[PDB]
């Protein structure tokens, strides 16, 4: 069993990561402004989509870049690339006890397209 | 010597012996790490305050804006493809009279090392990672920072390849200040979001410092 | 100092906080609810939202071995032994709940650096074990230990 | 949301699994008791101010009929001179010990202590209290009811 | 089914009465007294203080004497005629100001000014509130939705002896010409404890979860 | 064996702690005095919280006279002493208190026996 | 009586939950807080329990779950066909899972988790495929299509 | 020997890491107390017969001077009618509560209870006890000595 | 303040002993050697010396050891009532469900006051 | 009522088959193989050894060769033709004697001589048994109802590598003239593990609590 | 000086000052305790082995039999009404070929001090108190004692006013031995029941000894 | 990209068995039946099948069971090296400080690869 130790460097040198995956995801399924709900996909072994965001609805504020999902990259699988989105959630929609006094507080984090569905 | 120092020596010698990376690579990386710090980020904030056009670039393209302060996220690191752990997608979060950002990495310790240096010990603590996203008002208050209830406090959780630095609003009492004077009050804590710049304050708030067995 | 004893006391009584402590000794499948199943199979690094107490945050000086561990981990990635994402998965999740919170931050980085060398077969576990034995004796004999301890 | 509910249930369950160095105590020898531990063990359980704790969503709680009755009993015992409120607090919030102090309910301690003072000052023998408990159980078991808790 | 608490409660009460420690009448008399207790008197006292500078001075200097103005005599109103055994007779009124805001707690237990305020909130009795408020008041208050300027002196009052407190918050803006009743109406129990400030239009404590009792009163 | 009428006969129509008024004699301290809290043994009972031990505060009021809770809680009311309301700066109690909230304080009551001139 | 004895034994078991202790939670302590004794204890292999003190318990037999038998067969077949040797399985199953899961989850639960683990670690399937396969099985059940020999398709 | 010593320390240390579902108790509502828990919490601490425990290498322990003095004090108090041995056992082995019962040493409980009876029966006020402790501490700290325990 | 009689016990037991000083005060025993009895599960709030592990179990009285106030009363200064104490033998199998049949002859002997006994 | 385990089991199995790691037939073949396993072959080996001194010597010296006599070839009986992956091919028979009694365990896991003995007992896999037997064998055996003279050497065998064991108990009194079938009949699974000794009249493991499965085989 | 030593002094001084007991009572009690030990009990067992009639008396009336070895449960102690904690009802449990006794106090540490001395540290341990009554064979085995399965092992739990001492069966190899020779092999452990007497063994089995900070 | 050889084990062990398929590959054994050896406390990081309770203890080799790669190598797919495995008998008293002299003949037998052994 031989591991290819030059692949990443040959691909990203002079370009950068995630810039080296640019254009590989194709057309984005969502766009800025769309309201999306976070799917509660099985998180067995690995995931970078926090449990606290599961089932919550937020707003897409930016398509940040293209890249393999961490779920795949973390296991040496970079063949599939998808769009990543920066999503904003109202704190009250995450934490039931959040005070109405701070009704404008939010939380912004990035989620790969696979976890999203039209709200 | 500790079990950690023994294991560190074992791993490094093994890696070098197997030709995974060279002794030169290791020294080169440590030298690179040694040049990192909060200065470039502080200068970016100062330049943004003094130049509306540049501020817009910061907000829209952090990577491109970073080049103005001497930090090229792709070519500054020894790899020439960005550091393996920080990537190449810096975003600058601009505070406003109605918006104040605070950053964290709940999954680990993700930090914009290339432009800001090494993360604080507390920043990587399970405690900070657990509480900030849910009780930001309380955590910030513990840091001595309080904002109007109407102001939108936005917590940014860097869970993917993006890294953030906070561009706080320029404080009063800095009229006519030069770029150097302004950059001087933009501390590491200000760039993380747990503090706001203040005339006369050029260092992070003093807090306990746990000593290392074998430091520096 | 009285104040010192006061704060030491406030920290000590926390150890005596009463609780219903249920030791788990390989329960039968019929003892695992979906809730427990999800809790046990969670990825350890996902702690956002968990309740915790206030603590006086402190800074910490960097240990020489920590600096060396960081550089080793980045160099391994630089040279394609792994990507940062593979490291995080192994380092912040694969280590499991106990080690994740029981061991030091950079302790996990270091253990994982040693781990990737073995899992990807760049060195055998035997080579790793032997190297550790030789190192231990090296320090013990007075021969020295790199930049950590002179001869 | 059933998903949000599972999420919050999850955040709560993982706390049960917080790793720790759990040292059980089985009557250690004097040489194992430092001054710090001596002070911690001989403390008054009710003195909790300043102790670290987490944030919890505060709630109101409906009063149980037995709680109202317990409160009235304790104040009446004080009114009629069986004890003063201070003697009650000492027995109720301190003498019960650390485990019961946080393991049992607020009014449960009030009630246990009211039963205590009756026995400690010898107004009733422990025997009479134990027999009264039995009598109360038999009363319920025979469908004879129990005050305004259970109709016959 | 009845709980062990209800079984024991019956046992203790019957034994106490049998032994002549107190009578069945005494017990009913006390429950009736407790039933009449509420926050209205405290609210009225604050409204009166907002409208009468002299009375406010009285409240600040001698809460016991001032309490009489709202019909609550700490010594004679209770059935004992020597004050309730647990609340005593030394009420102090804490006057907030533009530079001072009070919040009360009893870290040792649940000491509360029952005679003039009523029964204590379940959360007021929790080890959690008793542990955190004295050390992280701003954090705890923020959780209740209350925040004050950093320069304002927040003062925590820990009722650890015989004194009981009620907070007299500053009169909120937008209440010009309001009658005593209108003012008293926005001074809720929570405002009197200090975890909230009065606001025009808010006449009930903030809604929070309500844990139900197995067999409620 | 137990006198169940004493308290009522003593406080009826007077109140508690009013019924102990004057029995403490002259106060050892006065409003304005800076005092430090003695770390007296708290074995079995005490109402002077551990978090105040060794801290220095300012007396802002002599609230009343009463036997200490330490004695009262055990049926010993023979001795009566002065009780003082003391104000502490939060930073003197909690090392981590923020300088941003430097005016915050904590007020509580402590019987004379725990006080000494600072 | 039988009912009394049951309450007695239930009592004896319940009081163990209240055994006093000095419970010290660990929150990523600094390197200076880790002694050699602690280092060895943390880096131990979970399966090595011989000699540890434990209490007497009335040993019991247990019926094999259908999923357990299938899990066992899957693990042996994976080895039979060279996906791994039994030693690789043991190391991943009884050691790599870590202290908490090792004693918190059921015996065969670890066999099953590890069988899924080897498919992913040796890249015979992506983690994405495993996760999607889990969702697939769930939908199959919720839809009433049944789940193998565990649940038959819904009827009328 | 050194290796074996490390081996046995290890076998003892991993016990601290035994996984568990650790549920802290913070004065739960009455609705959270089942009959089973009520009986467990109101149990008499000294009744431990039949509880599961591990095997331990039993050891002897030298008697401390203070332990012998405490034993004599407790028997003399009984000898002179301050209490009967049964009153001592109830206060010493049950009243101390679960936490102190197993957290503190055997004779530590004897001593604390000896001090307890003096106060509970009002032979000395808690103030006298507290002041005596203070004076003893100063006596030792001044270099004046402490009975047969410490020469001046 | 209450006055505690500190001479009562000594005046009652000197030259006689405890529990010899209570001899005869219990009257007639309700049970006798050989009787099979079951242990009643009386409330144990605050204090008891009849171990939980014996509740509901059946044993055989092998001896009437002496007379004395029950510990439940003596531990609270109440000695006006005296009762008979019985030494009872239990078969280990009746106490511990898991006890091995190989050791079918093992027993446990302990003392219990009359109030906890009822004919089996 | 499908559990998370059954859901995951289906997922793993279907994925393995889809990727051609093993076939559906392979899975059925392995299950059929397991169904043919039991403690009879091992009991038979003991009875044969009891009746044949030369065979006994063979058992003690080469368990693999001896196992063939009872129809269990550790190499060729399993579907693989190279022994089961987890049990390997190195069985050793431990012969008890008037001065030696063996008992087996796998402190590291559950290593058991499946090919000749069948599936291991639930308790054999328990952390409790695995922690205690090697250190307090006499105590554990007593709980099982087994006691040996203090002079007798109790030997605990910990199968931590590739060797698997079965215990050959001493032939019990009262079996004069017994046939092979009669003798094998009292050599139960427990006897082959060592937590019990064979006794005339006892042909089944000692009765102990049986924990029911949610969906039993 | 430890907290226990300070408290011991405080309690003793207060008790004497209030006249609860005298300084003389305290010295007298310590002197009494100093004369206690296993010797009398050992001699009772020896005399029983050497006189069947005395043995009968031991079995039926432990208190009366104890006088023969100089221990009057009522008058030997300073109180003249027996020690407050040990009382006056000693029972002697006679082992036989079919019966073997072992003693414990699950509620605390009740021991026949007047005739046997002070209890072993392990005897008072929660561990011994939880296990003996339920797993006597296992506990005894740990002590190195094992008896035939048919023999009746009887655990005596001294939960009330009775105290017990075990009279072990005389071991073989003692033909013609005198009272002193026989008393010499009956150790404290034999009298508790966790060991049996054996020719040549005149001291309890060696066990680790936890040292006191300031031993008597 | 990595390709795993899924047929190697079967090609090597079919008709032969495991550990028989490794016979002779270890060469000459370093120890023999009867030798007294002590167990080296080698690092256990990540994996080991030599129980902690045997570390530093001395035992007697009673049999050379077979040849095979150490589990420490096999568990990670490294089978290039094969060594001798030995069955070793330890006196219970040498493992457990508390073991009773009453059962002085009790022993524990287990297997350990050559790498962990050194002459006593
Ligand atoms: Co991170
Ligand atoms: Co209170
Ligand atoms: Co195994
Ligand atoms: Co006792």
Report d(CA J216, CA E12) in Å as an integer.
52
Superfamily covering domain D1-152:
Nitrile hydratase, beta subunit (1.10.472.20)
Tell me how long chain J is.
217
Q: Find, among D86, D80, D88, the residue nearest to D107 by Cα.
A: D88
What is the DSSP code (8-state) at residue H93? Answer: I
Contacting residues for K31 by C-beta, under 8 A, at least 6 apart: none
Structure tokens at A103: 């009704």
Report d(CA C78, CA C60) in Å as an integer.
27
Contact by Cβ (8 Å): F65, H116: no
Chain centroid to CA G87: how far? 18
Chain breaks in chain G (C to N over 2.5 A) after: none
Q: Quick one: CA dihedral L111, L113, L114, L116, positive or negative? A: negative
Contact by Cβ (8 Å): E123, E196: no
Catalytic residue among B88, B110, B158, B190: B110
The total of other beta-carbon atoms located within 10 Å of residue I101's CB is 10
Report d(CA K17, CA K36) in Å as an integer.
29
Distance (Å) from the alpha carbon of H32 to chain I's nearest alpha carbon: 20
Report d(CA K22, CA E3) in Å as an integer.
51
Chain centroid to CA F29: how far? 12
Three-class DSSP category at D22: strand
CATH number of C1-151: 1.10.472.20
Chain B residue with Cα closest to F98: B144
Superfamily covering domain K1-216:
Nitrile hydratase alpha /Thiocyanate hydrolase gamma (3.90.330.10)
Strand blocks (E) in J106-182? 153-158, 163-168
Judge whether A3 is closer than 8 Å to chain L, CB to CB: yes
Judge whether D102 is closer than 8 Å to chain H, CB to CB: yes
Three-class DSSP category at K44: helix
Structure tokens at G130: 């495993």
Report d(CA D19, CA D22) in Å as an integer.
9
* Strands of the sheet with A35-38, listed across from one edge: A116-118, A35-38, A57-67, A82-90, A106-112, B152-157, B99-104
Which of D3, D11, D57 is the closest to A55 by Cβ? D3
Catalytic residue among J77, J106, J159, J191: J106
Q: How buried is residue J190: exposed, middle or buried, by Cβ count under 10 Å (0-12/13-18/19+)?
A: buried
Phi, psi angle pair for J95, to nearest 5°: -85, 115
Three-class DSSP category at J50: helix
Report d(CA I68, CA C25) in Å as an integer.
47
Strand blocks (E) in L1-120? 36-39, 58-68, 83-91, 107-113, 117-119
Q: Find, among F56, F49, F61, the residue nearest to F115 by Cα.
A: F56
Place of tokens 């890491």: H17
Contact by Cβ (8 Å): B160, A49: no
Which of A44, A45, A77 is the closest to G123 by Cβ? A77
Report d(CA J158, CA J154) in Å as an integer.
13
Q: What's chain E's Rg over C-alpha atoms?
A: 19
Contact by Cβ (8 Å): L97, L20: no
Contacting residues for I119 by C-beta, under 8 A, at least 6 apart: I31, I35, I36, I37, I38
Three-class DSSP category at E1: coil
Chain centroid to CA B83: how far? 14
Judge whether K127 is closer than 8 Å to chain D, CB to CB: yes
Place of tokens 């600058």: B92
Report d(CA J160, CA L111) in Å as an integer.
6
Q: How buried is residue L18: exposed, middle or buried, by Cβ count under 10 Å (0-12/13-18/19+)?
A: buried
Contact by Cβ (8 Å): A49, A63: no
The distance between the two most distant Cα atoms of chain B, rounded to a whole number of Å, is 60
Angle, alpha carbons H40-H42-H47 (nearest 5°): 70
Domain boundaries, chain E: 1-217
What is the DSSP code (8-state) at residue E99? Answer: T
Q: List C-alpha distances in Å: J156 to J108, J149, J187, K147, L90.
A: 14, 16, 19, 22, 10
**Chains D and J touch, contact meaning at least 3 pairs of CB atoms under 8 angstroms apart:** no
Contact: K2, D30; criterion CB under 8 Å:
yes
Report d(CA L55, CA L42) in Å as an integer.
8
Q: What's chain D's Rg over C-alpha atoms?
A: 21
How does DSSP assign E157-184, residue by residue? EE--SSEEEEEEPPPPSS-TT--HHHHH
Report d(CA G123, CA I61) in Å as an integer.
72
Contact by Cβ (8 Å): H149, K1: yes
Report d(CA I112, CA G126) in Å as an integer.
69
Chain breaks in chain I (C to N over 2.5 A) after: none
Contact by Cβ (8 Å): H147, H70: no
Strand blocks (E) in chain C? 19-23, 59-60
Structure tokens at I28: 């007639």
Angle, alpha carbons J45-J47-J52 (nearest 5°): 90
Report d(CA G119, CA G115) in Å as an integer.
7
**What region does E104 belong to: left with phi over 0, alpha with psi -120 to 50, or beta?**
beta
Contact: L57, H10; criterion CB under 8 Å:
no
Q: Quick one: CA dihedral D106, D112, D115, D118, positive or negative? A: negative
- DSSP strand pairing (E163-168 vs E90-95): parallel
The total of other beta-carbon atoms located within 10 Å of residue J128's CB is 19
Report d(CA L59, CA D12) in Å as an integer.
50
**What region does H46 belong to: left with phi over 0, alpha with psi -120 to 50, or beta?**
alpha
Report d(CA H140, CA K8) in Å as an integer.
14
Report d(CA J210, CA G62) in Å as an integer.
5
Report d(CA D146, CA D149) in Å as an integer.
6
Tell me how long chain G is.
156
Structure tokens at J75: 């190499």
Q: Find, among A23, E84, E152, K76, the residue nearest to F11 by Cα.
A: E84
- DSSP strand pairing (B99-104 vs B152-157): parallel
Report d(CA G53, CA L98) in Å as an integer.
13
The distance between the two most distant Cα atoms of chain I, rounded to a whole number of Å, is 62
Contact by Cβ (8 Å): K38, K64: no
Q: How buried is residue B155: exposed, middle or buried, by Cβ count under 10 Å (0-12/13-18/19+)?
A: buried
Contacts of C6 in chain F (CB under 8 A): 39, 50-51, 53-54
Q: Find, among E43, K162, E16, the residue nearest to D114 by Cα.
A: E16
Q: Find, among F71, F60, F75, the residue nearest to F113 by Cα.
A: F71
Contact by Cβ (8 Å): J103, L92: no
Q: Find, among K170, H22, K80, the residue nearest to G23 by Cα.
A: H22
Strand blocks (E) in H3-124? 20-24, 60-61
Q: Which residues pair with D21 in a beta bridge?
A: G24
Q: List C-alpha distances in Å: F67 to E74, F76, F112, J132, L24.
A: 20, 8, 10, 59, 92
Contact: B7, C132; criterion CB under 8 Å:
yes
Report d(CA D49, CA E204) in Å as an integer.
29
Place of tokens 């550089």: C71
- One-letter-per-residue 3-state SS of J34-45: HHCCCCHHHHHH
Contact: F50, C9; criterion CB under 8 Å:
yes
Place of tokens 């100092």: C1
Q: Which domains does chain A have, with CATH numbers?
A: 1-119 (2.30.30.50)
Q: List C-alpha distances in Å: H96 to G14, H106, I46.
A: 20, 12, 11
Q: Find, among I14, B139, K97, H20, the residue nearest to C48 by Cα.
A: B139
**Chains A and L touch, contact meaning at least 3 pairs of CB atoms under 8 angstroms apart:** yes
Structure tokens at K176: 């013609």
Contacting residues for C75 by C-beta, under 8 A, at least 6 apart: B15, B20, B21, B25, B26, B29
Phi, psi angle pair for F108, to nearest 5°: -150, 170
Choices 3.10.310.30, 3.80.30.20, 1.10.472.20, 3.40.50.300: CATH for G1-156: 1.10.472.20
How does DSSP assign B150-184, residue by residue? TSEEEEEE--SSEEEEEEPPPPSS-TT--HHHHHH
Phi, psi angle pair for I16, to nearest 5°: -115, -50
Q: Which of residues 21-40 of I touch F (CB under 8 A)?
A: none
Structure tokens at G52: 């540890």
Alpha helices in chain J (DSSP H): 4-18, 24-35, 40-51, 53-61, 63-67, 114-117, 127-132, 137-143, 180-185, 189-193
Looking at all shown ligands, the one closest to residue C47's CA atom is: 1
Contact by Cβ (8 Å): D63, D107: no
Chain A residue with Cα closest to E140: A99
The total of other beta-carbon atoms located within 10 Å of residue A43's CB is 21
Residue B124 CA to ligand 1 centre (angstroms): 8
Phi, psi angle pair for E193, to nearest 5°: -85, -35
Contact by Cβ (8 Å): E72, E41: yes
How does DSSP assign H108-152, residue by residue? HHHHHHHHHHHHHTTSS-HHHHHHHHHHHHHHHHHT--BTTTB--
Structure tokens at J125: 């896999």
The total of other beta-carbon atoms located within 10 Å of residue A61's CB is 15
Three-class DSSP category at G127: helix
Contact: K155, I87; criterion CB under 8 Å:
no
Judge whether C28 is closer than 8 Å to chain D, CB to CB: no
Residue K84 CA to ligand 4 centre (angstroms): 13
Structure tokens at B182: 């302004």
Angle, alpha carbons D132-D135-D139 (nearest 5°): 140
The total of other beta-carbon atoms located within 10 Å of residue I26's CB is 20
Q: How buried is residue F27: exposed, middle or buried, by Cβ count under 10 Å (0-12/13-18/19+)?
A: middle
Three-class DSSP category at K52: helix
The total of other beta-carbon atoms located within 10 Å of residue D149's CB is 21
Contact: D65, E217; criterion CB under 8 Å:
yes
- One-letter-per-residue 3-state SS of D103-114: HCCHHHHHHHHH
Catalytic residue among K66, K76, K88, K109: K109
Residue B58 labeled ligand binder: no
How does DSSP assign A13-77, residue by residue? TTT-TTGGGTTTT-S-S--TT-EEEE-----SS--SS-GGGTT-EEEEEEEEEEE--HHHHTTT-
Q: How buried is residue E53: exposed, middle or buried, by Cβ count under 10 Å (0-12/13-18/19+)?
A: exposed
- DSSP strand pairing (F34-37 vs G61-62): unpaired
Q: Which CATH architecture does the domain made up of J1-217 adopt?
A: Alpha-Beta Complex (3.90)
- DSSP strand pairing (I117-119 vs I36-39): antiparallel
What is the DSSP code (8-state) at residue G46? Answer: T
Cis omega (within 30 of 0) on the bond before A21? no
Q: Find, among J164, C128, J19, the residue nearest to L78 by Cα.
A: C128
The total of other beta-carbon atoms located within 10 Å of residue F32's CB is 8
Report d(CA J31, CA J22) in Å as an integer.
13
Protein residues near ligand 3, an ion, with CB under 5 A: J 106, 109-111
First to last CA, chain E: 17
- Angle, to 10 degrees, between the axis of helix C105-119 and the axis of helix B3-17? 30
Place of tokens 């006061």: C6
Looking at all shown ligands, the one closest to residue H89's CA atom is: 4
Contact by Cβ (8 Å): F54, C1: yes
Q: List C-alpha distances in Å: B140 to D48, E139, K47, L77.
A: 25, 9, 82, 50
Residue E108 CA to ligand 2 centre (angstroms): 6
What is the DSSP code (8-state) at residue D150? Answer: B
Tell me how long chain A is.
119
């Amino acid at each position: 069993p031989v591991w290819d130790r030059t692949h990443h460097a040959k691909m990203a040198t002079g370009i950068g990561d995630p810039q080296c995956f640019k254009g590989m995801a194709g057309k984005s399924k969502f766009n800025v402004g769309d309201r999306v709900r976070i799917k509660d996909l099985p998180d067995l072994f690995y995931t970078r989509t926090m449990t606290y965001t599961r089932g919550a609805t937020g707003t897409i504020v930016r398509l940040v870049y293209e890249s393999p999902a961490a779920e795949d990259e973390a296991f040496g699988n970079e063949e599939n690339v998808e769009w990543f989105y920066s999503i904003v959630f109202a704190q009250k929609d995450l934490w039931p006890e959040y005070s109405d006094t701070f009704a404008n507080d939010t939380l912004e984090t990035e989620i790969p397209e696979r976890y999203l569905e039209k709200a | 010597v500790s079990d950690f120092e023994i294991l560190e020596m074992a791993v490094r010698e093994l890696a070098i012996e197997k030709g995974l990376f060279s002794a030169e690579d290791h020294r080169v990386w440590k030298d690179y790490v040694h040049t990192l710090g909060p200065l470039p980020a502080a200068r970016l904030v100062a330049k943004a305050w003094l130049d509306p056009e540049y501020k817009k670039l910061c907000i829209e393209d952090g990577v491109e804006a970073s080049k103005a302060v001497g930090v090229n996220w792709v070519t500054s690191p020894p790899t020439q493809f960005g550091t393996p752990s920080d990537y190449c997608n810096l975003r600058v979060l601009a505070d406003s009279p109605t918006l104040k950002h605070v950053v964290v990495c709940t999954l680990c310790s993700c930090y914009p090392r290339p432009i800001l240096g090494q993360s604080p010990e507390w920043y990587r603590s399970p405690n900070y990672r657990r509480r900030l996203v849910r009780w930001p008002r309380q955590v910030l208050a513990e840091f001595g920072l309080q904002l109007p209830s109407e102001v939108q406090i936005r917590v940014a959780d860097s869970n993917q390849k993006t890294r953030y630095i906070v561009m706080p609003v320029r404080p009063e009492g800095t009229d006519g200040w030069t770029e150097d004077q302004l950059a001087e009050i933009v501390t590491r804590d200000c760039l993380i979001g747990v503090a706001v710049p203040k005339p006369g304050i050029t260092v992070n708030a003093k807090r306990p410092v746990l000593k290392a067995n074998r430091p520096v | 100092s009285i104040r010192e004893e006061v704060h030491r006391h406030l920290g000590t009584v926390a150890l005596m906080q009463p609780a219903l402590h249920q030791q788990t000794h390989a329960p039968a499948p019929t003892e695992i609810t979906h809730t427990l199943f999800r809790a046990y199979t969670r990825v350890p690094h996902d702690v956002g939202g968990e309740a915790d107490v206030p603590i006086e945050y402190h800074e910490k000086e960097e240990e020489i071995w920590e600096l060396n561990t960081f550089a080793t981990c980045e160099c391994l990635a630089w040279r394609g032994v792994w990507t940062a994402e593979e490291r995080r998965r192994k380092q912040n999740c694969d280590v499991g709940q106990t080690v994740y919170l029981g061991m030091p931050y950079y302790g996990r980085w270091l253990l994982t650096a040693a781990r990737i060398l073995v899992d990807k077969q760049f060195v055998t576990l035997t080579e790793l074990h032997n190297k550790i034995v030789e190192m231990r004796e090296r320090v013990a004999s007075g021969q020295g230990l790199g930049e950590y301890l002179p001869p």
